[PDB]
């Protein structure tokens, strides 16, 4: 670039990108684990992973990686999948 | 700008003698030029143009300004012609001329432009200043003792005064009751052919 503030914001934005990347990846990993537990058919394991994943989604929404509405939609989908299981 | 050329010849081209004091036209009647006394084709456009120019050169107004006056008159209510005459008479050069301080609109224009007048306290170097109802037109302190205003106060019995105007002091302060109506104007001209011209 050619401005100091942007030159710094490059570094900052990369930092925040790495953070949000790690967080979202952990979330998608939790969700794939949950969905594996469900499509396999386990129930109590699925409920435990659901609590953990909902916790992590609330956490990411509080950090700002995602929106609370997005977290809500994700965990609602998880809960309804578990219920209909 | 303004027309600083000969004055009689315009009156000669237009028939009506706006000021007077020549013998060529007054013995032989003709417009200026070698082709005076020529044959004329009597066009309504010449009639109309001649009244417009009569107004223009009786006052000291040029066409790009007279057009604006016409447009003001046409927009604002009443008869466009007498509104236009009211406008042309409600300007500083004309009011002081009609008050007799100058006995020529050219002289009145020079006076106002040189600043030998003022209006309600503030100096005025604008002959096109549109005076209004209840306007005190004072003369400044050098000007009252100057020669032209001495001549004014001396010979302030030659030409009459309009009704809408009156002088009030020996210092030649001037007052405006209202703005003139077509009876108050007292100008050797109609006002319909001009609006016909600008409606063309």
């Amino acid at each position: 670039a050619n401005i100091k503030s942007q030159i710094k914001r490059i570094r900052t934005n990369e930092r925040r990108r790495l953070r949000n990347q790690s967080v979202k990846s952990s979330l998608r990993t939790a969700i794939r684990g949950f969905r594996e537990a469900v499509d396999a058919g386990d129930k109590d394991k699925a409920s435990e992973l659901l609590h953990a994943t909902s916790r992590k989604l609330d956490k990411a929404a509080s950090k700002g990686v995602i929106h609370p509405n997005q977290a809500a939609n994700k965990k609602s989908a998880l809960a309804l999948a578990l219920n209909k299981l | 700008a303004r027309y600083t050329g000969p004055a009689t010849r315009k009156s000669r081209r237009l028939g009506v003698d706006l000021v007077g004091g020549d013998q060529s036209f007054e013995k032989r009647p003709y417009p200026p030029g070698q082709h005076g006394r020529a044959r004329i084709k009597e066009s309504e456009y010449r009639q109309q143009l001649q009244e417009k120019q009569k107004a223009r050169f009786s006052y000291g107004v040029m066409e790009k300004q007279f057009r604006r006056y016409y447009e003001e008159a046409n927009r604002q209510p009443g008869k466009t012609g007498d509104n236009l005459l009211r406008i042309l008479e409600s300007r500083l050069d004309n009011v002081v001329y009609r008050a007799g301080l100058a006995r020529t609109r050219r002289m009145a224009r020079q006076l106002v432009s040189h600043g030998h007048f003022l209006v309600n306290g503030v100096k005025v170097d604008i002959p096109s200043y549109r005076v209004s109802q209840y306007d005190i037109i004072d003369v400044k302190e050098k000007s009252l003792n100057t020669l032209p205003f001495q001549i004014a106060r001396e010979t302030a019995g030659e030409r009459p005064i309009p009704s809408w105007l009156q002088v009030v002091g020996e210092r030649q302060r001037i007052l405006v009751h209202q703005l003139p109506e077509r009876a108050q104007i007292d100008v050797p001209l109609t006002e319909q052919l001009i609006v016909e011209l600008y409606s063309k």
Partner: protein, 113 residues
Amino acid sequence: AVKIKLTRLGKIRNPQYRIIVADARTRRDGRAIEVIGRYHPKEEPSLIQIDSERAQYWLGVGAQPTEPVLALLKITGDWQKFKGLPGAEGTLKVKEPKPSKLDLFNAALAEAE
């Protein structure tokens, strides 16, 4: 941020301002949510006309004024009417109406003696 501002109007050396309320992200000569006053500082008393009720509305809902218009609100007492410190000052002074041209006309007629 919603803000009370002065929109410049008027010709070149005649900065007649209009006291508006608008977002900070707008531009000076831009779209105004509402007009609540006007500010002509070429008068010696430098006219400060305003609309107190709407000013109080926008301050109550949280329109951060600019510094000049803040001073103007302090003058009109609306700032003080909003916070409540000396109640409402009412520091405003207006241009005294100069005498009527008719009165001058009649006075000079009387002098015409």
